[model samples]
Target: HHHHHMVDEILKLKKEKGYIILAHNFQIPELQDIADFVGDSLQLARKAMELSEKKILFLGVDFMAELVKILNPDKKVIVPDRSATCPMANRLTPEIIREYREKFPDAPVVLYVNSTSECKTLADVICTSANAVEVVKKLDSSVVIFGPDRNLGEYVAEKTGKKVITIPENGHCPVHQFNAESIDAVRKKYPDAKVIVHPECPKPVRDKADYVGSTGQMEKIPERDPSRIFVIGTEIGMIHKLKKKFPDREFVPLEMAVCVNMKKNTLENTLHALQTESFEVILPKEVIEKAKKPILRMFELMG
Candidate 1:
């Protein structure tokens, strides 16, 4: 009950200040429970766009918070920790984008949502793991430049039959690089369990998985598949989300995977963010204007 003191104050302050908390699926379970909404990056961004609340406390990495801000420029968006950022996203930069663009003028640049805002400004289209295949498939070009997460790009290539040139050679999420051996172990242990993995995983792991999808897609699998047990091959935080969503089902981690950056936003810092309303997510007007084009294109292509 001692922890409830902080939780109680957070809820009170949230109401008093008119701040709606938007957390990612990869956030800690405590934060997820207190959040107004908890979902994948695309889902959180969509939720931010639809909210009537003008003030938001985003509890994920900087790029995702920036995405929400880019989508809702008029709103005030803040984060508990300003330093929380995606390492894989940072691997692909403007310099790399320029070099690749010059090399393949015929190719359209398809940036993943994990990319930097500056890079997004130059992209022809943006996509999330949930829709990368669909987005690339819809593109008129048979050849495309995709980046930040090479594994996702390769997965998209497999799905769309397009030539996806992944930028910043070998870019990948460390958290999703679980060994195929883990899948092997899980299969033996939970013989009847269905295995789900992220598209960001290496090809071997994806091939071993019963289903490969984004966290958003993974959330829906229990509904349709009716699996009593699931072996999840993604970040460890996601196990909490899956369990809460499908309490009756047994959710087991493929391995112990954690994103240190994602773990930076703790309850203490979140409470401090609400109490002080500091560290607001700020982007230049031009950056917002330029970055939004690719994101909007993503929506248009999806429609």
Candidate 2:
């Protein structure tokens, strides 16, 4: 009786397979709908670590899957597609980090969680979207180099009253950078809509918004009320998730915001990964030990 283009055969096979699927907030609704859970990468991975489920399939980039495997070595952590890489993570590597340390021996390193595990090993601290600003304030270093996510780093720098140089290669979210000007252009056509965005968005776009915060925070607006019209300013995939939750609310995306990496986690690949339990995440033993410290310390710093 369901309307899925793919049949229940896949779902049935997955149900029998017994894998808890987790996705990031940015995933397509089709992926999220099929996933057992969806939220921020670190938070979801952390929760999966607490679960009794022995098998987990995560639909995110390499670093995210690595976190799950690192946290729960006993369980299996599968990423639907291993090639679903983060551009920013590719921008900064372990070798570049070593060079930075040598060039600025006294400078502190702030590793954005958007980076790779190798990047984390080079960092003195780690930061997530929820804690980036507050965590930056706690650092006492006079010189700081925030690697990966220039937009987010710049946002944090402004909030903390600190001058931190951003690595241009820090992968920017092509979607979040689209501001209210873009929204306003559309609004001139449809002036009745209210605009909301994520803080991962540029400061200019975020400040002018009717509301702003994490994707979960963005979800809260329509959740609190049964009826609301929204122009959501995030990825196009997010619109799919919003429609399911706020069926009563009129939610529209700012533009055609697509990330091929986020879109690549199709149901076919997910079922294949879990049914066979292939494409699991792994890091060298040394990398895991080195990377674990920065992430754990990040939690401590925020607490």
Candidate 3:
């Protein structure tokens, strides 16, 4: 109840301050409920770029906030937790990309949006799980280099039937780290439910799923057929959204996946952040200019 009052106060402050909050799908409900916009990386990026707000409070990981800052160059983007980061994003470096560029010079570099600003600049095209397959398939080059999340890269490769020269990395979305065995356990418990998984999940897990797509895509699945039970293989926060969106449908998790990074921003920090505008994201001019290209290219290719 105190949080509700806090939310009301925050909204009043946001209105007076003209601050726009962009929350990710994986964020907790309190933040998500109060956000001006809530979506996946691509959705948030486009929204940030198009919106007129001068201040943006990004409620996601470091990479997501970085992407927001890159897209909305003039806006003051801040996060509640400056330390929040994605392991998948931190895995790739400029040196790593340069080395692969030499080996796959002919291949266009396609990076997932889960990368740092430096990595984005190095990429020929930046894609989210929402549009990775489309980006790879539409690229002029036959061979493409995808980085950071090898699982998403492999999934794109299979979908496009193209020669995807992936930059190998052990880092992946921790939320999708469940074993393939978990699928069987969920299936055994919920025999009537259809399985749905994110592309970031391991191949074995995705292979057995009834559907594999991005978070946004998965959201649509339940809507198409409201009566069916679903076993979701993404983060637990997503289940919160599903339950609210489809009150009559049964939604179960194959494995309870939680992302500590996304959860770093609580009601306390968020209010503190708004009050003080703490932890403004600052990137170098060179990084911003370089990173801007791939994101623009993504729009061009997606168009």
Candidate 4:
């Protein structure tokens, strides 16, 4: 990624060159500044569906970039790097997913957006952390099938007072797992700021949260409560985005919360993807049509 103070270079180049940058929460600080639009994963994906842009550069992972391509096959969607990947999403595949559904025929499937495109294609409807429980409640199934992140699935299940059929409840991001105990460690090391984290933290850590939310939710820390002492828990990109918004506030990470994948999308990679138009994501129309139901159902239940 370009250095943190990259001011409007991407924006100016994009305006002149007729390009649009839609960024995810995990994008580096500088990239967020120049992005035509910066949002959480769900918001960006939904925005892609609505856009008629001739070309788009997705500053997230491959699955997201692929969603843009699926929505606008006529428009060119470029992902900055091929190497960047989501570990959890890649953890499950379409065939195995179908097998899960088959094994639990009665349970309604709830898929998280952290899933890969192939996983999305196999799911009923997609959800972010904020609305997962609501999706489950809305589905009203006696038992629910949720995937990729059992921690999130169990949270929804527990919150809704329903049977959330997932394995372990500890499938959390290593960074998100840091709690009050760890914050004590952080405080011992850097004693200035209060701890603010994502909802993914375990209950005890979540209990001590100065703040808790999705990426969009976490990003709201500065705008909503500016000029505060804060330690952020997310990919370091959110930290970068926050610093730009409130240069006055101290937004620190407990550790290196940065995702290597988010860093993988560099200015050089973006330039190459745009200049050559070398790669595009192609999925069968049948798969798209098949996968639509679960996602549509999830959205409907969420509402």
Candidate 5:
């Protein structure tokens, strides 16, 4: 009864206040269900850009909410948890970026979208895990500086055949670091299952997978590959997303990997966020102006 009440109020308040709730794929199922649109970082930002809504309640980590606000600076963006933040992203600081730039002056800095908005100002172009490879490949340089996720940088290097100098040594998402043994175990349990892993996973885990892609890319796999079962190697929340999208096919986690930060947003706090509308995402005027350059460059390259 309590859960139902919260859900009803969230919906009611969302409409009453004229707010659109945008959630990330890594969000819990209940929160995802209540969101107006559920997607990956790039998708959520793009969704926010296209939407006419003046207010957005973003359910994700700080970097993501900041990205939405950066893209749609005029829109009011709020989050349930102001403390929800990415540890991996925090590891790559402005100091490290400047150090790497001096060392490799010619190599363009291609920061992941999961990075800080402040860091985005220094990037030559911003790329999400979904478009990292394509973004780098389109660049004229054979060598590029990538960061905040070493695994993703390596994966992009492998795909684009570019020299990816991953900064802040050993940067990675703890949630996607599944042991290769988990894949072996899942393979024995479901012999016919097709494995799909995030590029943020270590090479060993990614190497054994049938397909490696971002969560956005993973969503499209079911449409093309009619697999009866899929062994997913990413955060646990993605299972709920996939199952809801393709109810017929079975979705299994290769390992029970969870991002504590992603789960920080709960129905209770989300309801409170809607009620109070506190914790609005705010960035400096110059930060938005400078950060938007790389993000817009990403779209221009893609086009």
Candidate 6:
């Protein structure tokens, strides 16, 4: 009841403030339900650019806010929680990327959108989980320095048959390792359920999954077959959205895939952010312009 009331108030303030709410698939159920747009990184980034709203309240972590700011320099982008940082993104440093560039000058840099602003500026093109394979295949180079996420890089390498240089296994998202061994249990529990996992998961979990793709792709499984049930191996927040969107179908989670950082924002904080305009995302102009190029190149190649 409290959450619903807050949601109502937030909606009212959202309209009054003209703040476009962009939530990630990993955010809390309340925020995901109330968001103006809820999707994966790529989808949120696209909406950040395409929307005419001058102010966007991104509900994800810091990297996501930076991405929105990179795409829409003229617009104001803010997140309710300033401390909501992505560990996966923070692991890839500009220094490391530069060193890789020195080593492999010919191999174009293909960055996962789960990287920091400094790291993004060093890339040839940026890609999200949904389009990583597509972007990698489109690259003219025979090899690429695929940074940050080792699992995602390996997944891309398999799909594109490109030599991918990625971070060590320890650098991958820690949450992805959770409940990987339990998929077989889920299979036995729901025999008819189609299993889907995000590429960020380890090869073992991914190998067990019936479908491996982005949260956007996972959501589409039901669109192709409405009667189908599912075993979602990513964040549990996704199942919250899936159940609401496709109530007729059953969606079961392997385990809790909570990112503590993502949960920092609540409806109250969101409302507080709009009222106070605190925790605003401000970036250097030079950084924004330099970082924007690779992202723009990604879209150009995508079309």
Candidate 2 lDDT, tens digit per residue, 227-295?
Answer: 467888887767777777778888888777777787777777776786678797888778888888877
Q: Which residue runs does candidate 1 get wrong by more than 4 Å?
A: none
Across residues 240-270, which tens digit of lDDT does each residue of candidate 5 receive?
9999999999999988988999999999999
lDDT by residue (1-303, candidate 4, tens digit) is: 354323435555566657678988788765666677888876786787787568787888877776666556677776768767777566666776677688888887677777776677767667788677667777747787777776677667667898876622334555566656777786777665667777666677666666666777776666767446788866677777777767788877865766777788776666666666545555677756665666666657765
Q: lDDT value for candidate 2?
A: 0.75
Instruction: State in Å the error of residue 200, model 4.
Output: 3.3
Residue 202 lDDT (model 4): 69
Clashing pairs in 5: none
lDDT of 1 by residue, 88-141 (tens): 788888999999999999999999988989999999999999999999999899
Q: Which stretches of candidate 3 lie over 4 Å from their true place?
A: none
lDDT-sorted candidate list, best first? 5, 1, 3, 6, 2, 4
Model 3 misses residue 95 by how many Å? 0.9
Give the candidate order by descending TM-score: 5, 1, 6, 3, 2, 4
lDDT of 6 by residue, 37-88 (tens): 9988888888887887899999989988899888788888888999898877
Ranked by TM-score, the better of candidates 4 and 5 is 5
| Model 5 poorest ten-residue lDDT run | 168-177
What TM-score does candidate 2 get on C-alpha atoms? 0.88
Residues 52-147, model 3: lDDT tens digits = 778998999998898888887789998989988887677789898999899888989899888888788888889999889888988888788888
Q: Which residue pairs in candidate 1 have backbone atoms (N, alpha carbon, C) closer than 3 angstroms, thus clashing?
A: none
lDDT of each: 0.93, 0.75, 0.86, 0.69, 0.94, 0.86
Give TM-scores for every candidate, taking all chains together and pairing residue i with residue i. 0.98, 0.88, 0.95, 0.84, 0.99, 0.95
Better of 1 and 2 by TM-score: 1
